Amino acid sequence: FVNQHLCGSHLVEALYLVCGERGFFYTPKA
Amino acid sequence: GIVEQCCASVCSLYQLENYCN
Ligand code: NA
């Protein structure tokens, strides 16, 4: 489900799901 | 950054995993 254009909450939900308990960092600007 | 790579273009598992802690 990751091989598409993922924007906004959509992208964050993909990080959330794939990263699991590791967590992630979301830096839209850098 | 991830916007350019995953929003402006098609994302990949590889790219997303780059942002996992
Ligand atoms: Na891309």
From Swiss-Prot, chain B:
This is Insulin A chain. Transmembrane segments: none annotated. Disulfide bonds join 6-11. Coiled coil: none annotated. The chain holds residues 85 to 105 of 105 of the full protein.
